[PDB]
Design a protein around this ligand. Sequence first.
Ligand SMILES: [K+]
Ligand SMILES: [K+]
Ligand SMILES: [K+]
Ligand SMILES: [K+]
Ligand SMILES: [K+]
Ligand SMILES: [K+]
Ligand SMILES: [K+]
Ligand SMILES: [K+]
Ligand SMILES: [K+]
Ligand SMILES: [K+]
Ligand SMILES: [K+]
Ligand SMILES: [K+]
Ligand SMILES: [K+]
Ligand SMILES: [K+]
Ligand SMILES: [K+]
Ligand SMILES: [Mg+2]
Ligand SMILES: [Mg+2]
Ligand SMILES: [Mg+2]
Ligand SMILES: [Mg+2]
Ligand SMILES: [Mg+2]
Ligand SMILES: [Mg+2]
Ligand SMILES: [Mg+2]
Ligand SMILES: [Mg+2]
Ligand SMILES: [Mg+2]
Ligand SMILES: [Mg+2]
Ligand SMILES: [Mg+2]
Ligand SMILES: [Mg+2]
Ligand SMILES: [Mg+2]
Ligand SMILES: [Mg+2]
Ligand SMILES: [Mg+2]
Ligand SMILES: [Mg+2]
Ligand SMILES: [Mg+2]
Ligand SMILES: [Mg+2]
Ligand SMILES: [Mg+2]
Ligand SMILES: [Mg+2]
Ligand SMILES: [Mg+2]
Ligand SMILES: [Mg+2]
Ligand SMILES: [Mg+2]
Ligand SMILES: [Mg+2]
Ligand SMILES: [Mg+2]
Ligand SMILES: [Mg+2]
Ligand SMILES: [Mg+2]
Ligand SMILES: [Mg+2]
Ligand SMILES: [Mg+2]
Ligand SMILES: [Mg+2]
Ligand SMILES: [Mg+2]
Ligand SMILES: [Mg+2]
Ligand SMILES: [Mg+2]
Ligand SMILES: [Mg+2]
Ligand SMILES: [Mg+2]
Ligand SMILES: [Mg+2]
Ligand SMILES: [Mg+2]
Ligand SMILES: [Mg+2]
Ligand SMILES: [Mg+2]
Ligand SMILES: [Mg+2]
Ligand SMILES: [Mg+2]
Ligand SMILES: [Mg+2]
Ligand SMILES: [Mg+2]
Ligand SMILES: [Mg+2]
Ligand SMILES: [Mg+2]
Ligand SMILES: [Mg+2]
Ligand SMILES: [Mg+2]
Ligand SMILES: [Mg+2]
Lengths: 154, 123, 102, 319
Amino acid sequence: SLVKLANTCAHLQNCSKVRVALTSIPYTKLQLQFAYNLYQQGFLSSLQKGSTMGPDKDFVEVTPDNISTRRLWVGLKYRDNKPVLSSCKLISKPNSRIHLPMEDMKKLCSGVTIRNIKPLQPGELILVRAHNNIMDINEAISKKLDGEVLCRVK
Amino acid sequence: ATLNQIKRGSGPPRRKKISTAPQLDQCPQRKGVVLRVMVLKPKKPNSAQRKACRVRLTNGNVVSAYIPGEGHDAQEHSIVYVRGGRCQDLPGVKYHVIRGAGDLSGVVNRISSRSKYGAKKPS
Amino acid sequence: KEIPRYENRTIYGDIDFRYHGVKLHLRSAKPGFGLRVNHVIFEICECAGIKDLSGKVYKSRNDMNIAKGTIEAFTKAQKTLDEVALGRGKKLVDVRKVYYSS
Amino acid sequence: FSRRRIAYPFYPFKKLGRQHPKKHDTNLKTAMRQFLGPKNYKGEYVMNKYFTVPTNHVPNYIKPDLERGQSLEHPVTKKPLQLRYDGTLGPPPVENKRLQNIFKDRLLQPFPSNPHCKTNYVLSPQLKQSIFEEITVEGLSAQQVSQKYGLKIPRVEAIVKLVSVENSWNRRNRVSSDLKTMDETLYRMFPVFDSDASFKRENLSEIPVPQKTLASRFLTIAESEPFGPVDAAHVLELEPAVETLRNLSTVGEHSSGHQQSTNKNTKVIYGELVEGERSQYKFTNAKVGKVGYRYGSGNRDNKKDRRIGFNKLGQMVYI
RNA sequence: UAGGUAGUAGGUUUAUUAAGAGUUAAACCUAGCCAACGAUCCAUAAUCGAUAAUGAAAGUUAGAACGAUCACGUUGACUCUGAAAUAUAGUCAAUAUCUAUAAGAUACAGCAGUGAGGAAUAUUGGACAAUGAUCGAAAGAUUGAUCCAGUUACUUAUUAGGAU
RNA sequence: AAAAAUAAAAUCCAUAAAUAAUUAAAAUAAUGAUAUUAAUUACCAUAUAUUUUUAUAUGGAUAUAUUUUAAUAGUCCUGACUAAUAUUUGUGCCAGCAGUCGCGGUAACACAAAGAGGGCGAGCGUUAAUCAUAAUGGUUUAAAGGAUCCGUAGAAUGAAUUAUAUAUUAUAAUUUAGAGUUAAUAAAAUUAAUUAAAGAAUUAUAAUAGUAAAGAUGAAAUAAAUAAUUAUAAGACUAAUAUAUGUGAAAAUAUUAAUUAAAUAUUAACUGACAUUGAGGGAUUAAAACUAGAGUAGCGAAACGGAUUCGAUACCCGUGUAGUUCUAGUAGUAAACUAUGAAUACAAUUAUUUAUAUAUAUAUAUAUAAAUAAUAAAUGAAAAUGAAAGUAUUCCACCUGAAGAGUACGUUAGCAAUAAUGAAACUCAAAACAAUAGACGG
RNA sequence: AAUAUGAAUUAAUGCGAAGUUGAAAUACAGUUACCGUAGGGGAACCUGCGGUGGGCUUAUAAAUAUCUUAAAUAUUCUUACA
Ligand SMILES: [K+]
Ligand SMILES: [K+]
Ligand SMILES: [K+]
Ligand SMILES: [K+]
Ligand SMILES: [K+]
Ligand SMILES: [K+]
Ligand SMILES: [K+]
Ligand SMILES: [K+]
Ligand SMILES: [K+]
Ligand SMILES: [K+]
Ligand SMILES: [K+]
Ligand SMILES: [K+]
Ligand SMILES: [K+]
Ligand SMILES: [K+]
Ligand SMILES: [K+]
Ligand SMILES: [Mg+2]
Ligand SMILES: [Mg+2]
Ligand SMILES: [Mg+2]
Ligand SMILES: [Mg+2]
Ligand SMILES: [Mg+2]
Ligand SMILES: [Mg+2]
Ligand SMILES: [Mg+2]
Ligand SMILES: [Mg+2]
Ligand SMILES: [Mg+2]
Ligand SMILES: [Mg+2]
Ligand SMILES: [Mg+2]
Ligand SMILES: [Mg+2]
Ligand SMILES: [Mg+2]
Ligand SMILES: [Mg+2]
Ligand SMILES: [Mg+2]
Ligand SMILES: [Mg+2]
Ligand SMILES: [Mg+2]
Ligand SMILES: [Mg+2]
Ligand SMILES: [Mg+2]
Ligand SMILES: [Mg+2]
Ligand SMILES: [Mg+2]
Ligand SMILES: [Mg+2]
Ligand SMILES: [Mg+2]
Ligand SMILES: [Mg+2]
Ligand SMILES: [Mg+2]
Ligand SMILES: [Mg+2]
Ligand SMILES: [Mg+2]
Ligand SMILES: [Mg+2]
Ligand SMILES: [Mg+2]
Ligand SMILES: [Mg+2]
Ligand SMILES: [Mg+2]
Ligand SMILES: [Mg+2]
Ligand SMILES: [Mg+2]
Ligand SMILES: [Mg+2]
Ligand SMILES: [Mg+2]
Ligand SMILES: [Mg+2]
Ligand SMILES: [Mg+2]
Ligand SMILES: [Mg+2]
Ligand SMILES: [Mg+2]
Ligand SMILES: [Mg+2]
Ligand SMILES: [Mg+2]
Ligand SMILES: [Mg+2]
Ligand SMILES: [Mg+2]
Ligand SMILES: [Mg+2]
Ligand SMILES: [Mg+2]
Ligand SMILES: [Mg+2]
Ligand SMILES: [Mg+2]
Ligand SMILES: [Mg+2]
């Protein structure tokens, strides 16, 4: 759900403003892939599966009996009195989805405004979804993949 | 407005200057015949005896044109050429007569800005 | 105050900053691009040492609030490559600069 | 705020006092006569320090800021002379310290307000002959001579072309005394090029800056990932910068690597020429869809950007 | 302009055509079809480009000039020939003019030119030398296509004196 | 530092044109309209050397030299926007200038000119036009949230896992976090409709004794009493509690009882995305008003009188009709207001109530929600908002300078009053909001 | 029947100057203003009915207070004592 992703991006912005070290997001494949990319890119300190009450200390298999109570717990980073994850916004919106060919993704990473999308900025992460996998735009360009431009994180 | 409201017509109003000389019919100037020469009083805070003229254009539109320059020889039945441009202090006078065209002569003894007053170059 | 400058000529990336009623949209520019911005922003860039910049002001164009907003934007809305790298634990490479390196 | 400003000298000068009614002089004119000094009966300005050319390979460029407008000196001793109350020229009261230790860069800077403009070095008549004899006789490559004397390859190729013209002129006695006098005078006005002097040597690593690369792309990679010029070139989809430099060094007509044969693949026919025919037909194979004048092309003749060219005879022709 | 449609929407068959189809004509059935994402109606307009103008760009504007497409040759309908024409043909009628007074001829939106209208847009020019087109076996003939020149700062460009 | 001005003249050297010779190319088998061709050369021709080009020497050709020879730009502007500092004269709110702001009433940088100056330039100016010049917008208070909710279309949006496919979509299976169904347990007695009752008072009438003034107002005056104690009749209204707390979609809703309908929390089981929003549409909708039939105490447009006043078509007083009430309808409008559409996810505190649950050394304590109040952050033109007017997402309505105007015309609807829809021309460079310091305030 | 034109005839409105009759609004504007609606009046406006605050949150006391070693001891103390 792109709506759920929009909710998560706004949630991370709210948590960053107050500087909470740990917060939770809905437990779904898309959310997990989104969080994992942020973790590997250095925006998140930690990524743990858990429940509504907190991160799990020991592995807890997820089943239909407890799926409704599952959450993903992410640790936010702050350095030099500034949040590392300051802004998080969708590019492809629920009411206007943007699918770009690899050629247009290369233009976006080169300073060209494509379909009103402002180009990639220094130190910014743009994520793309292709065949239900989320990856950085630079990785999609390397794999010659066409995909939906989901969001930009800075 | 929402994305669907924009799809249905919502948008920013367009900015383009509007015509201030509708009686000319999108022409640089139109010939006319003076119906009556008149003297009008500026709106405050201005004071003067501004010379104007009522003119019937070749397209049937009747307009009020300001006669620029010091002194004019325009009379009734005189053939005049009317261009755009309003007289700011005279409400309802939205046009100018061209000096040195038709039966309206150039300003007598004009030295500066002669081209604006139909005055030929002195030898 | 000291303001970060990329290559001591421009800003790091783009800035969309709101100072009261002034909407500032500032974009970094290539070397030799010059200053193509509001006249108030131009003077500030000259004193600060910014040589290349593009931008547009929306909503309020009050000179006083453009100047203050610009100063605030140059300090609160910029992040150096070094600060981004350290915060994320990643290496950030300027491709144009590497292309002309040994 | 702006107003018209008469260009009065920035330095102090003796302004006009009470004037006889028929002089009709100006403060600008009197400031110029003070800069120029007296004019002799021959129409010369011997007291001005710029009237005569230097003869020691050191340019005499104007230094108004450093001399504060004092342009007069003794024509033989080169000793400063300034205007006094009597209306005569004499030694200054205090020596000018700003004119005795001038930076080396400033000596070559002709315009006071622009320190990015400097004169070039003149090549000696000997170095030119050496370069000419190495490229033509010894058969060295322009790349070698360029890397040896510290001269850019285009300049090296130009020297060979010009020395060839000087031999033909000297072989037909076309270089007159006046030309020799003028050449020597101009030679003694410029700093001579020294191949050994490192600072005088021309940079040999310059490449044109492309436009696609002029933008600033940034990549976020792993903290310990190596990224070098070759990787950057792949990202920017350009040949490595070192390769560009090497390809630009093989362009000289006498440089190594100069090659042009991949184009000799276009069928050409030269029509038969018969006695009495004033011209020959040359046919060049082309491809339908590329050859021909297009229909409905933009007419620019009545536009400011109308195309203007020059034919083989040098005559201006519309393209 | 909110309801519109009655060959109207669909089915079957014949006629007609090289050829499908309510395309036209004839017959018989079904009750449909279009429409507030704007029907029907009214007004306005020749359309467009790898053309022109403008803008950072998306776009916006023009549709003269270059090119593509359509329609028309005073107005309407019809017919003939033909692969193709409701033809700048023919027929009849309409409007206007003309002379030969005939069931007559002409219609400059071909070139030049004139009057009119308008703020405003040119010579009653030269040549078939070039490129094309028609006729002819050829020699050649014809060509206001076309090529040139004239008029007009309407646009563009170059030049319109340097040293002292 | 007031220049005009290296400007002029003069000096040096050129080229164009002219003159002379020569002469391509458009075209060749031949044909040239253009054409008095372009170009080149400067006595012509030739030889040699000679990037080009240059140079020498030769044949003929004139008197050692060899055709001649120039350079007259206009137009707008100089208060600010907007480049124009060297000043001066005339005019005196006149004459006139003006794209915008404006200028002109005797020191006019703006009018008309001189001087000087700034643009563009064989053009310059001006008019008519096109493009660009802010939505990288807004609607509590400035233009702008629809009175309210229900719900149709939506070519609007919308959960989870897995597997395929031709892939942000489709299909299938599976799942329960959204949305619902039914029970159980606890809680509450409100909101609609209907029926049945109660209450204090008011007015009128009658009786009673008892009197002579009563009533009203700022003060007044107009129209066997007033007051008191009884009895009777009628209509309307609903004191305290009470906070509209709460409840209801809004409008609304507080004397009592009854009937019918709807409404809460938690738990258990169940359905398995069945949801959100909602054009058009539908329903409900204060007060006034209207159509019928009842009612009519009090109140009260109008009308008629009394006062006040210089006047008083008013404010105050009297008499008081419609109306206000009930029944059955029409109509769909309000500052129908939180001047703030609905839904979802989310973000830092405190206080105070309420609810449910838990515990006990039984009355507090601990939890989780809701409401309200004050705030952090954030947002904002600010006043302020504060769980939204914050961070986001989805859907609908609406706005695009003032005035003209919610007017005109048409149309639809209504018994009617009217309601809905809803312009343009002309004119102007205004117009509006928040806040600041004053002044003023019966 | 439509479109266009003129049109007897007739309706609404703007600006300009410029007085007149009143004093309706802005302060408690001297009767709180305004919204809807109805009636009335030279004119603004007045009056009835409900609504709104864009007017009264502008909100600010019926007062009363207590016992342990006052010092040879707390009050001093400078990295000390322990
Ligand atoms: K239509
Ligand atoms: K034409
Ligand atoms: K021909
Ligand atoms: K000039
Ligand atoms: K607002
Ligand atoms: K309530
Ligand atoms: K399912
Ligand atoms: K729906
Ligand atoms: K609706
Ligand atoms: K009554
Ligand atoms: K309210
Ligand atoms: K709504
Ligand atoms: K009042
Ligand atoms: K009212
Ligand atoms: K009222
Ligand atoms: Mg200026
Ligand atoms: Mg058929
Ligand atoms: Mg049909
Ligand atoms: Mg039929
Ligand atoms: Mg037409
Ligand atoms: Mg177009
Ligand atoms: Mg068009
Ligand atoms: Mg044409
Ligand atoms: Mg035809
Ligand atoms: Mg026809
Ligand atoms: Mg015909
Ligand atoms: Mg004709
Ligand atoms: Mg013609
Ligand atoms: Mg005419
Ligand atoms: Mg001819
Ligand atoms: Mg010549
Ligand atoms: Mg010939
Ligand atoms: Mg003028
Ligand atoms: Mg004066
Ligand atoms: Mg001016
Ligand atoms: Mg003037
Ligand atoms: Mg002058
Ligand atoms: Mg020109
Ligand atoms: Mg735009
Ligand atoms: Mg809103
Ligand atoms: Mg509302
Ligand atoms: Mg409203
Ligand atoms: Mg549930
Ligand atoms: Mg009594
Ligand atoms: Mg009560
Ligand atoms: Mg409440
Ligand atoms: Mg709904
Ligand atoms: Mg009744
Ligand atoms: Mg009364
Ligand atoms: Mg009703
Ligand atoms: Mg109304
Ligand atoms: Mg309303
Ligand atoms: Mg209400
Ligand atoms: Mg709901
Ligand atoms: Mg109405
Ligand atoms: Mg205010
Ligand atoms: Mg009063
Ligand atoms: Mg009053
Ligand atoms: Mg009042
Ligand atoms: Mg009354
Ligand atoms: Mg009232
Ligand atoms: Mg008030
Ligand atoms: Mg208040």
